[PDB]
Design a protein around this nucleic acid. Structure first.
Ligand SMILES: *C(=O)[C@@H](N)Cc1ccccc1
Lengths: 427, 134
RNA sequence: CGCCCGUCGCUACUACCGAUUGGAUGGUUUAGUGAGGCCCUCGGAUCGGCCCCGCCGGGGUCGGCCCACGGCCCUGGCGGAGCGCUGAGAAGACGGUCGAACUUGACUAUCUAGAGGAAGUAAAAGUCGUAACAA
RNA sequence: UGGCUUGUGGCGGCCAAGCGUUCAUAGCGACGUCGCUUUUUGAUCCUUCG
RNA sequence: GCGGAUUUAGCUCAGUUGGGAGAGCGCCGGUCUCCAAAACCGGAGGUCCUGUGUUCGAUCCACAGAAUUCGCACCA
RNA sequence: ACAUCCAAGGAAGGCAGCAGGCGCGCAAAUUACCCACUCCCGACCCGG
RNA sequence: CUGUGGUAAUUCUAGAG
RNA sequence: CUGCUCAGUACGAGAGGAA
RNA sequence: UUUUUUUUUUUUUUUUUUUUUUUUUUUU
């Protein structure tokens, strides 16, 4: 049964965690006694409507504020697939976390509230339906399902006109991003009631498409590049009684087996795999797509962090002394010059990088040079630029390992530009 | 031949006059230094202070005050190589060791009984010559 | 125009002294309290065997043509079912020695905080006087 | 104690050169001037040593 | 992960409310000397840590980074 | 005296035995293969 | 050993033949 | 006076935060 | 028998940093 990684994305409060939680529940992955206890705890803290969300949101600050802060990973299994599902935050402060999530994903569920004002807000200039869609594209997610959520809400009440309104807006925007919009399901659901999650909903007779589970089965599994050299960007590092220090991350390329000797770049520390675990099931090998924790003998937690990359010793992950990229500028309030230093979000990493030169401005559609060494770039421009990371950074050429070779540029907490790396000068 | 005990007792007691023997005899070695008799102690560079040489010799000597790990006590330490200052940064882990038998510092040095040999769990020789590390 | 002494002013580091009846640590502990097992006076949820009586079934003898029947010995079933006596036997419980642990203090051994007071040592030279070396 | 008076104490007030980044008064006000007050203190000797 | 401080001359620190910085040592240099010490003159020295926003103008504010620090959270 | 999971009711534990995690530091390994050897333990085999 | 049972959970374990 | 809903709301670029 | 012998201080504190250089047979 093929495995897939699913990221759940969308604007703050639109219903991401409630969807995932409620889906896991009616699919029977969550103990009724636990759902009962969560509900009681939720009511007693003034937050009844967070009972499904609190399956995913566990941190003290998440519960206090009623928001997701960082990623949660859950295994569930449909008729055709086994999914690792990744719950991502909508809050603008934590889009860096959502991005690491997208970097690990094969497909995305975009959760979009149909409630009056909630939709418009998410799709507004500085909204996260807009931003998350953009970032998901740049991190290389092609398969997308959209859950038009909260159909149950009184200000919505299962209205097909409201639904078709959000669908059309979403379609015009998504097509401008390069999505193949004709192929993607727009399912009207209620993460809270359950409508169209797993079974079909009587409240919405006018809807003929897949339910969300059906839409999942209609996805297609991605290429498994087992013959390219091992690369595992670390998403987090735990220190675990019995195991020791265990990096977690999704195997992008190559294969990893217990016994293997592995190196973590850019620090250059080397350890040896004691064990491998996916969703609490011990493994002996892990292949691309596997989202795993791997115990490492001889490595201290302080040696390694998120955004580090693990490969085998003979073909270690490339550390960029500098690198070259083709970029498009989504948004900027003035202009970008040589010297501009946004943070680069690539795979699980995020490191400020200085533009040391702008070799050429390109026509954004054709790719031809329109000017050698432009005096600056502005919103709407495309370019070939050189980048020097402020601290050691791992990147690969897009042509070689695309999952370590696509990136976003962010500055003053906004997404400014997008990029693919066309060349790397190794450290 | 029957007076053996006096000579036996006399020897051990007169022996107390040997200070090094005395040093082993009294639990002093364990408590006379921050180490506890230990050859090496990991530490942190609290500050870097330049110091002046003693007597006719005139020089600026590189000196570091170090906070020890288990001990938690102030230490006066000597920086050894030429431009080690360029390579010594505040709060980088440092391993320290002593000079020629415990007691007195090199005659040129003032109040330092300790030597700095590691930076960030890296030996000094490597930073000092270009071929090794940077 | 040689050596040489001490107070006094900087700067640093050791050790001595110390209002707080000073704080911290670990060992032996006086006394008051006392879990818990165990020996031991009991108790007695409960179980079985024989005691007495009546009724039938079956083996062996005696008084009866019988057959039922009665007596002895041995079992099966029912009532006074436990009503008479016996044995092992859980909860509990008398009084104990052992004796955790609690508290209250002791006491050693082992470090330690502090306004100030007082030496020294780095000690090259600032400032006062000539003590010692040539009666 | 009480009492005249209010220097001293306390409080408002006319004028607006200034603060208040632009501007005087939103919020404050030099100087200069009008006063209210009798829980401070002061001066006065009127009532109380028969 | 979150949140606070701090970063200004070779050194150590002061300023500030956006018109753009200021002192103590320094240390160096010269005179005297074998050379210093003392003495006496002389030195002009800062992307105000960085990007962006705002603005006519950003050392200063806002928003974002780095580095150092200090709280707090998380806990394979 | 530590301290693990709590369906709120309870239930456990003594890795100073191999491995393996942490801690501690100046300072010491791997979550392996096996009864073939040396023995030993159970009853007349050949288990462990 | 049959069957009949209770508990989040442990080498839990009743009652009945 | 305090709490529960009012409500992490309107108003904010946030910090925040009502009635 | 042969020898003393007075005199005595009226007035002299101090002197910065650093100082230096050494090694052998064999005769032509
Ligand atoms: C260890 O649990 C990982 N395999 C799963 C995980 C838990 C917490 C944080 C990160 C990863």
């Amino acid at each position: 049964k093929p495995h897939m990684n699913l990221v759940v994305i969308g604007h703050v409060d639109h219903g991401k965690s409630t969807l995932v939680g409620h889906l896991l529940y009616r699919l029977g992955y969550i103990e009724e006694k636990k759902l009962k206890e969560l509900e009681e705890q939720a009511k007693s803290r003034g937050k009844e409507s967070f009972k499904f969300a609190w399956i995913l949101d566990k941190m003290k600050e998440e519960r206090e504020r009623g928001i997701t802060i960082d990623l949660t990973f859950m295994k569930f299994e449909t008729k055709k697939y086994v999914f690792t599902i990744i719950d991502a935050p909508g809050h603008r402060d934590f889009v860096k976390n959502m991005i690491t999530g997208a970097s690990q994903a094969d497909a995305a569920i975009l959760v979009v509230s149909a409630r009056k004002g909630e939709f418009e807000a998410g799709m507004s200039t500085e909204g996260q339906t807009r931003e998350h869609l953009l970032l998901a594209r740049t991190m290389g997610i092609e398969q997308i399902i959209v859950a038009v959520n909260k159909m149950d809400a009184p200000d919505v009440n299962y209205d097909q006109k409201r639904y078709e309104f959000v669908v059309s807006v979403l379609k015009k925007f998504m097509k401008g991003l390069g999505y193949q919009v004709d192929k993607i399901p727009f399912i009207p659901v209620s993460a809270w009631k359950g409508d169209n999650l797993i079974e079909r909903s009587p409240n919405m007779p006018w809807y003929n498409g897949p339910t969300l589970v059906e839409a999942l089965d209609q996805l297609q599994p991605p290429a498994k590049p087992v013959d390219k050299p091992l690369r595992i960007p670390v998403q987090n590092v735990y220190s675990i009684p019995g195991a020791g220090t265990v990096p977690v991350g999704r195997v992008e390329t190559g294969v990893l087996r217990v016994g293997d000797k592995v190196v973590f770049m850019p620090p250059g520390v080397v350890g040896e795999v004691r064990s491998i675990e996916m969703h609490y099931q011990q493994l002996q090998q892990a292949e691309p797509g596997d989202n795993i924790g791997f115990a490492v003998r001889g490595v201290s937690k302080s040696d390694i962090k998120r955004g580090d990359v693990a490969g085998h010793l003979d073909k270690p992950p490339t550390v960029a002394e500098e690198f070259e990229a083709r970029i498009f500028v989504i948004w900027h309030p003035s202009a970008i010059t040589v010297g501009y230093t946004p943070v680069i979000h690539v795979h699980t990493a995020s490191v400020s990088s200085r533009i040391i030169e702008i070799k050429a401005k390109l026509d954004p559609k054709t790719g031809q040079v329109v000017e050698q060494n432009p005096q600056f770039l502005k919103a709407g421009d495309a370019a070939i630029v050189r980048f020097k990371p402020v601290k050691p950074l791992v990147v690969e050429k897009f042509s070689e390992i695309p999952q370590l070779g696509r990136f976003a540029m962010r500055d003053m907490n906004r997404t400014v530009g997008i990029g693919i790396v066309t060349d790397v000068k190794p450290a | 031949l029957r007076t053996a005990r006096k000579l036996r007792s006399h020897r051990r007691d007169q022996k107390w006059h040997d200070k090094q023997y005395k040093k082993a005899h009294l639990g002093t070695a364990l408590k006379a230094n921050p180490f506890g008799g230990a050859s090496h102690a990991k530490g942190i560079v609290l500050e870097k202070v330049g110091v002046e040489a003693k007597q006719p010799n005139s020089a600026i000597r590189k000196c570091v005050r170090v906070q020890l790990i288990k001990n938690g006590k102030k230490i006066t330490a000597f920086v050894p190589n030429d431009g080690c200052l360029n390579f010594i940064e505040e709060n980088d882990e440092v391993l320290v060791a002593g000079f020629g038998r415990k007691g007195h510092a090199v005659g040129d040095i003032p109040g330092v009984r300790f030597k700095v040999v590691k930076v960030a769990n890296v030996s000094l020789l490597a930073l000092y010559k270009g071929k090794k590390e940077r």
